[PDB]
Amino acid sequence: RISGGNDKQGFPMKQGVLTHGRVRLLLSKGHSCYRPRRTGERKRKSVRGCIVDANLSVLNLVIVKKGEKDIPGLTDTTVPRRLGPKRASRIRKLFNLSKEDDVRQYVVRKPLNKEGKKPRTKAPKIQRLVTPRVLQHKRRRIALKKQRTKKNKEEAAEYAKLLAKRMKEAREKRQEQIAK
Amino acid sequence: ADIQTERAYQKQPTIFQNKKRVLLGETGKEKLPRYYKNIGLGFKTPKEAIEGTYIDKKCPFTGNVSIRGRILSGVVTKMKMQRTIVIRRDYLHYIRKYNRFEKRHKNMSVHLSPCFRDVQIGDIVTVGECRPLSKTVRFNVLKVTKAAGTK
Amino acid sequence: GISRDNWHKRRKTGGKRKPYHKKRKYELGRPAANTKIGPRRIHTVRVRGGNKKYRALRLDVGNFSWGSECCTRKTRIIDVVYNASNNELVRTKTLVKNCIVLIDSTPYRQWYESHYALPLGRKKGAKLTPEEEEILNKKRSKKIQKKYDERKKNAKISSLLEEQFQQGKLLACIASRPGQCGRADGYVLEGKELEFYLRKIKARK
Amino acid sequence: XXXXXXXXXXXXXXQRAITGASLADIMAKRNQKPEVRKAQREQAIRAAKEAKKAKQASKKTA
RNA sequence: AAACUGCGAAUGGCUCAUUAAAUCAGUUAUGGUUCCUUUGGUCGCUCGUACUUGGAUAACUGUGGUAAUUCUAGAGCUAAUACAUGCCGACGGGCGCUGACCCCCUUCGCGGGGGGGAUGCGUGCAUUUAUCAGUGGUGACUCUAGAUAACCUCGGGCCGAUCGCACGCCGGCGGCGACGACCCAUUCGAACGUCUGCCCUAUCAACUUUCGAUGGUAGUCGCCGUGCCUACCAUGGUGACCACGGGUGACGGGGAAUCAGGGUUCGAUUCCGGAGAGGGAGCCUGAGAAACGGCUACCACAUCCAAGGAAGGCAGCAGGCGCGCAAAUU
Ligand SMILES: [Mg+2]
Ligand SMILES: [Mg+2]
Ligand SMILES: [Mg+2]
Ligand SMILES: [Mg+2]
Ligand SMILES: [Mg+2]
Ligand SMILES: [Mg+2]
Ligand SMILES: [Mg+2]
Ligand SMILES: [Mg+2]
Ligand SMILES: [Mg+2]
Ligand SMILES: [Mg+2]
Ligand SMILES: [Mg+2]
Ligand SMILES: [Mg+2]
Ligand SMILES: [Mg+2]
Ligand SMILES: [Mg+2]
Ligand SMILES: [Mg+2]
Ligand SMILES: [Mg+2]
Ligand SMILES: [Mg+2]
Ligand SMILES: [Mg+2]
Ligand SMILES: [Mg+2]
Ligand SMILES: [Mg+2]
Ligand SMILES: [Mg+2]
Ligand SMILES: [Mg+2]
Ligand SMILES: [Mg+2]
Numbered sequence: 001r002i003s004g005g006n007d008k009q010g011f012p013m014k015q016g017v018l019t020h021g022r023v024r025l026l027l028s029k030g031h032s033c034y035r036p037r038r039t040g041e042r043k044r045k046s047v048r049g050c051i052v053d054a055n056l057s058v059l060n061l062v063i064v065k066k067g068e069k070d071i072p073g074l075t076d077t078t079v080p081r082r083l084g085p086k087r088a089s090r091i092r093k094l095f096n097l098s099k100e101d102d103v104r105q106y107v108v109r110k111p112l113n114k115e116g117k118k119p120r121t122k123a124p125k126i127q128r129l130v131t132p133r134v135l136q137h138k139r140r141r142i143a144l145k146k147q148r149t150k151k152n153k154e155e156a157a158e159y160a161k162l163l164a165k166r167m168k169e170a171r172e173k174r175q176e177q178i179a180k
Numbered sequence: 181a182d183i184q185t186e187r188a189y190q191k192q193p194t195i196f197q198n199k200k201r202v203l204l205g206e207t208g209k210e211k212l213p214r215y216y217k218n219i220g221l222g223f224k225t226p227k228e229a230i231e232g233t234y235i236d237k238k239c240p241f242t243g244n245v246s247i248r249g250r251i252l253s254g255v256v257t258k259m260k261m262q263r264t265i266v267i268r269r270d271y272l273h274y275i276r277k278y279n280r281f282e283k284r285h286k287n288m289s290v291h292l293s294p295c296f297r298d299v300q301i302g303d304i305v306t307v308g309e310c311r312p313l314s315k316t317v318r319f320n321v322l323k324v325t326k327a328a329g330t331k
Numbered sequence: 332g333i334s335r336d337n338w339h340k341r342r343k344t345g346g347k348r349k350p351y352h353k354k355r356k357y358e359l360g361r362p363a364a365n366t367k368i369g370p371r372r373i374h375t376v377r378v379r380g381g382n383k384k385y386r387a388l389r390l391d392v393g394n395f396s397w398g399s400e401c402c403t404r405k406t407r408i409i410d411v412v413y414n415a416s417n418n419e420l421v422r423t424k425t426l427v428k429n430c431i432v433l434i435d436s437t438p439y440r441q442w443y444e445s446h447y448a449l450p451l452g453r454k455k456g457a458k459l460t461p462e463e464e465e466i467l468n469k470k471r472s473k474k475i476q477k478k479y480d481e482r483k484k485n486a487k488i489s490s491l492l493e494e495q496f497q498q499g500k501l502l503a504c505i506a507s508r509p510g511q512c513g514r515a516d517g518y519v520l521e522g523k524e525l526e527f528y529l530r531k532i533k534a535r536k
Numbered sequence: 537x538x539x540x541x542x543x544x545x546x547x548x549x550x551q552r553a554i555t556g557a558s559l560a561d562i563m564a565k566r567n568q569k570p571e572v573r574k575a576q577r578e579q580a581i582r583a584a585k586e587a588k589k590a591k592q593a594s595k596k597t598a
Numbered sequence: 599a600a601a602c603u604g605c606g607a608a609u610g611g612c613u614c615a616u617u618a619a620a621u622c623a624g625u626u627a628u629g630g631u632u633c634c635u636u637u638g639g640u641c642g643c644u645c646g647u648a649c650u651u652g653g654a655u656a657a658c659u660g661u662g663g664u665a666a667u668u669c670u671a672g673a674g675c676u677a678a679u680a681c682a683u684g685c686c687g688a689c690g691g692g693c694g695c696u697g698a699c700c701c702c703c704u705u706c707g708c709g710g711g712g713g714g715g716a717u718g719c720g721u722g723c724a725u726u727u728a729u730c731a732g733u734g735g736u737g738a739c740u741c742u743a744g745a746u747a748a749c750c751u752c753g754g755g756c757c758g759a760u761c762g763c764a765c766g767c768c769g770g771c772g773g774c775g776a777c778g779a780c781c782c783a784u785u786c787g788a789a790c791g792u793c794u795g796c797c798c799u800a801u802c803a804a805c806u807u808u809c810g811a812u813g814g815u816a817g818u819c820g821c822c823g824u825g826c827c828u829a830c831c832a833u834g835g836u837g838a839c840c841a842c843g844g845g846u847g848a849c850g851g852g853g854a855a856u857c858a859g860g861g862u863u864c865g866a867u868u869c870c871g872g873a874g875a876g877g878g879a880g881c882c883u884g885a886g887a888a889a890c891g892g893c894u895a896c897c898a899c900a901u902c903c904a905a906g907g908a909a910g911g912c913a914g915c916a917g918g919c920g921c922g923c924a925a926a927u928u
Contacts, residue, residue, distance in 0.1 A: 004672040009906055010664025012671045022907095026894075028882080033670060038607085038892055040883030045669085046907080058663050060672040082659065083676050084554035089651070090676090095565050099647080101577055106565065111556045121556075127677065128759090130649045136772085138649090141758070142687080143772070145642045149688085152643080186815045187531075187830065188415035188429065189524045194740050196729070198521035200399045203487075220738025237815095244740060246629045249792055261813045262832060270839085273795085277861070283839055286794095289343075289812080309792060311630055312824045314813065316343050316835080318792065332880070332888085335819060335826040337790090342619085344836035345806035346843080351617050352873065356888050357632090357789065360819050360826075375753045379821045380632045381885060385725095385751055394749050396728035403728060403748040416817045417829045427817060473709090475697080507726055510818070513751050516727045552674085595766085 002052065004060025011048040019049035084108035088128045103129065183233055190235050193244070216241050221251065221308065223322045228295040236263060238313050239293030240320050247320060249309025254288060256301050264291045264317060267305055290319040303327035333360030364510045366390055366426040368408055373513060385513025390426055393515040395503050397439055400446070400486070404438040408515065409500060413532050426515045428508040431528060433500045434519075440496055447486040448479050452496025491525055502528065 005013020012033040017023050027034035028042045036043070052059065063074065070076055085091045088103050095106045103126060112120040184190045194215045216230045219240050229241040237243040254267035267288050272281035290307050291314075292299065299305065303326050310320040336358035338350050357379065364386045372389035396403040411424045413431040420427065440451045448467055453459075459467075471479070495501045502525060505517040520528060553559040 004662085006663040006671065008664080010666090010669080011907095012663085012669095014671095035670080037668075038883080041892055042882060042894080044894065058671085060662080062673075078552065079660085079674080080553045080555045080558075081675050082555045084557070086676055087678095089647095094562070098573070099649095101573060102580060105580070108554050109556050124676085128650060133762090134760090135649060137761080138759095139772075142642075145688085148640085149642060184527065185831095186415075188816050189527050190815085191524070196398065197523060198399055199729090200485075215740085217740090218738070220736085222737075246738065248629065248738080249627055250625095252793080258835090260832095260834065264813060266835080271794090273839095279860095285839060287836080289835080291813095309627080310823095311628080312791060315810095315825060316812075317824090333819080333827085337824080337826070338620090340825085341806065341811060342836085343812085344841060345811055346836090346841080347806095348620065349617070351620060353879090354888060355789095356886090357821075358826090359888080363818060363828085365818090371751080373751050373753070375751080377884095378632095379886095381634090382632090382821085383751095383753095383755095384820095386753090387751085392749095394727070396747075398728060401729055401747060405749065414817085415815080415830090419829080420817090429816060472697085472699085477710095506728075508818085511820085512726060514726055514749070516749070518728060554675090 001062040001064045002059070003062050004058070005048055005050070005052075005056060006058035006060075007048040007055060008057045009048075010057065011046055013050050014047045015050050017047060017049040018051070020051050020053055020055070021049065023047050023049055082110075083124075086124045086127060088126055091126070183235060192235055192242070193237075214242065219247055219308075219322065221247070221322070226295050228297075229293070232295055234294040236294055238263070238291055238320075239295065240308075240310070240322065241293060241295065243293075245310050245313070245320060247308040247310055247322065251306070251308045251322070252288075252319070253304060253306040254290075256299060256303055256305055257287075259292075259299070259301065261289075263294060264289060264314075265299070265305075265321075266290075267307070288319060289314075289316045290321060291317050292321045296321060296324050299324050300327065303330075333362070334358045335360040364388065365423070366509045366515070368410070368424055368426065384511050386511070387426075387509035387513055387515070390509055390515050393432075393434070393505065393517060395434060395516065396518045397521075398518055399488075399492075399521050400443070402439070402442055404442060406434045406438055409433040409435065412502070413528060413535070426505060426509050428505055431502065431504050431520070432515075432517070434503050436496045436499050436501050439501065439519075443486075447482055449483070449486060451488075452493070452499070454497075489522060489525070491529065492519075492521060 005011075007013075011022070014025070014032050017025075023046075024044055025047045026042050026044050029036050029040070033047065034043055034045060048056075066075065085094055085108070091097070091103050091106060092099075092101070097103070097106070107123055107126065110122040112122050192212070192215050195213055197212050214230055214232075216225060218225055225241045229239070232242075235242070238245060240247055252269065254269040256265055256267050259265040267290055268285050269288065270283065270285045273284045274281050288307075290305075291310075303324065305321055306323050306325070307319045308322045309318060312318050313320070334354045336354065338348065341347055361376070366387045367389050368391065369389035371391055372387070374386045374388060376384045376386055378384045391408060392405060393408050394403060394405040408426075410433045411421050411426065411430055412433055414420045414425075414427070415429060416427065420430065426432070436452060443449070443451050444467060448469060450467065492501075502520045503517055504520055505515050507514055507516040509515040551559060551562070553562065
């Protein structure tokens with residue numbers, strides 16, 4: 001499957017453009033082949049189109065299906081992924097775990113070594129792991145919710161009780177002044 | 181009738197006329213209740229507003245504006261604009277060097293509610309300041325006093 | 332871009348002033364959002380202070396108050412009959428504040444006939460369907476029949492309105508400006524204004 | 537004369553050995569059946585419960 | 599370390615080209631608006647996978663291209679307070695409309711009256727509209743609060759899927775903090791208005807209005823008040839109290855020099871305000887720029903080139919050239 005462009009002048013190929021040669025484009029964030037210096041800045045740049053010619057410096061090819069014979073560079077040796085999964089659910093995925101299995105046990109460890117230095121095992125910190133801390137913060141903020149509700153209850157009761165002591169004296173003043 | 185000149189219908193935005201009634205109360209009369217407000221500085225809102233039939237949104241009494249700011253007075257000179265007049269304020273500007281004043285004047289365009297009428301060129305009008313009504317019109321006529329020679 | 336500034340302008344006397352500063356952000360005008368009747372289309376604009384202005388390119392529904400009987404229902408908009416500002420704006424059928432518009436009688440007539448149990452805008456042919464007869468003729472209990480009967484004194488309608496229902500289309504006017512607001516919402520034309528505008532639109536012929 | 541057809545291509549996640557666990561270990565833990573895993577879970581859970589009530593006794597001791 | 603994220607880069611610094619009721623000063627207003635932050639308020643008021651959810655991407659690994667840059671493509675991985683998605687919980691209800699049926703009083707009975715009630719439909723703050731009534735507040739609201747009907751943007755509003763430190767209590771409970779957050783209020787403001795004030799000129803006496811001049815009515819646009827802009831009407835508005843036009847070796851003030859009293863002259867320059875970043879114009883980002891140590895053009899200038907292309911902005915500090923009577927250390 002055809003992927004990457006480069007042309008004799010060095011420009012990338014942007015998958016949208018339908019031409020052969022250069023096109024001047026205004027690139028914004030999220031577009032291909034430009035990474036912005038300042039937030040929300042656009043640049044005008046030169047982009048070689050998505051159609052393939054003898055003009056190209058370089059052409060990048062993905063391999064979708066392997067047919068028969070093994071190529072020297074691209075097949076025989078397999079290079080591992082460094083860095084297995086850092087998120088809890090991704091781990092439950094890799095190892096097919098029910099919700100009730102300890103993720104802590106299954107995490108991939110990096111077998112770190114160097115000449116002259118003691119052999120190490122590294123493990124990434126798991127994120128989105130339920131844990132005494134996380135569980136605590138929850139009941140914490142709920143507790144704050146109880147507090148607010150209580151406060152509104154007590155304050156309401158209070159001001160209601162105070163309003164009456166003003167109201168009976170307003171009635172006393174109005175009634176006494178009127179009957180006079 | 182005769183109140184509605186314009187292409188659009190002429191209303192008093194804060195009053196609901198179409199409140200339904202018995203056919204015994206429809207035979208009595210149609211009197212759409214005025215909205216009028218008491219303007220604050222102690223100008224009694226004229227009789228001709230609260231009874232009157234006209235509709236002007238920019239009038240201080242029967243419409244939406246609030247009178248806050250400077251309160252000025254002047255004399256009416258030119259009224260050919262519809263619902264506005266040009267008044268002139270005179271004063272003496274002191275020149276320090278010569279120790280004397282020179283005369284000066286300024287012309288203000290100022291809006292005039294159709295309740296006041298018979299407002300006649302050369303009579304004293306006291307105005308108060310409003311939020312801008314137009315390009316040159318920032319004021320509003322609060323009360324009209326006749327010229328010294330009225331009969 | 333479009334500057335709604337005051338300083339490109341003559342003085343009160345009319346001497347042109349030379350602008351002291353070049354155009355400022357906050358004096359900016361935007362392009363006109365004309366609003367047409369069709370399937371709902373809306374574009375959010377970010378304005379001064381970072382608040383969202385909701386802009387309406389195509390509208391269909393609007394909700395309206397039938398003020399006499401004090402209700403409000405969510406209705407489908409049909410057409411622009413009349414505009415005080417511009418005839419051009421009627422022609423392209425553009426929704427602005429205070430232009431005048433035809434709406435479905437339907438949800439109103441439904442509410443009404445549920446409230447008063449009375450016929451509205453029905454043909455003198457009198458032809459009815461089962462749901463209709465079971466809502467209108469219904470069944471009552473003593474306290475009920477007294478309630479409804481007590482309201483029957485109240486409900487009678489301006490001949491103009493009555494006719495409108497018979498045609499299926501009501502005359503209404505838009506109080507909210509869809510351009511900045513995002514909804515075209517408004518009120519049914521009743522009584523004096525209704526008769527007035529009727530006179531204007533008969534005059535349009 | 538024209539093209540009416542829009543091709544639908546599929547995405548496949550293959551498997552690679554992740555550094556520190558070769559594909560044999562990944563598949564060793566993956567293909568592990570429900571009996572094995574349920575035993576391991578309940579055993580670790582009970583070991584942890586014992587350590588925890590031991591540390592509750594060690595909270596009330598101090 | 600890096601990189602993502604958040605914030606800042608709108609201040610400060612420089613200069614005085616433009617600019618003559620403009621800027622600006624004292625004066626007032628915002629009841630006609632926007633406001634990152636800070637400070638306090640709110641944040642189980644809504645009756646309808648959660649002991650935790652989805653996908654991607656950078657650093658990193660690697661394969662690269664181009665003479666050239668703070669250029670960047672393709673392939674592998676993997677995070678969140680990035681993006682998204684989305685619950686339990688309180689919660690039992692209360693209140694509105696509906697009301698199958700039921701009771702009681704009354705009645706010869708119809709009827710009249712008082713109730714009680716299964717059933718659905720609605721249920722908060724913001725949003726937009728209409729109507730009703732008249733807790734608190736003003737010199738004055740079409741104010742604030744209340745009640746009714748509905749509304750609610752797929753280019754979506756609020757309701758915390760987050761972080762740390764102590765560790766304790768009867769398998770449950772919680773102390774302090776950190777970020778967040780709609781909305782009030784507040785602070786810093788900002789933006790438009792009010793009243794009065796400017797140098798010379800008549801060898802400038804009439805000026806503006808088909809292309810908004812002045813006002814009216816309805817809108818559009820805007821953060822809102824406004825010919826700001828459109829549509830339709832009206833024919834206005836300014837002027838010897840000097841309009842309009844021209845000039846200024848004109849940024850305006852606070853001030854300076856000189857002075858008996860009165861003046862005359864100067865204020866580019868360290869404080870306050872305004873404008874501008876070679877000239878014009880136009881936008882992204884944002885609470886806030888029409889920003890220039892952001893960007894996109896055109897004009898004028900000028901740098902690199904492998905001739906395809908790329909990159910510019912000292913009226914910041916130094917310093918250099920030119921101009922000049924005239925001004926300091928890379
Ligand atoms: Mg805000
Ligand atoms: Mg960064
Ligand atoms: Mg901050
Ligand atoms: Mg706060
Ligand atoms: Mg690399
Ligand atoms: Mg990749
Ligand atoms: Mg107007
Ligand atoms: Mg208007
Ligand atoms: Mg016009
Ligand atoms: Mg100058
Ligand atoms: Mg000077
Ligand atoms: Mg100065
Ligand atoms: Mg200097
Ligand atoms: Mg300064
Ligand atoms: Mg500037
Ligand atoms: Mg220069
Ligand atoms: Mg910012
Ligand atoms: Mg610029
Ligand atoms: Mg610079
Ligand atoms: Mg700067
Ligand atoms: Mg220098
Ligand atoms: Mg020399
Ligand atoms: Mg010297």
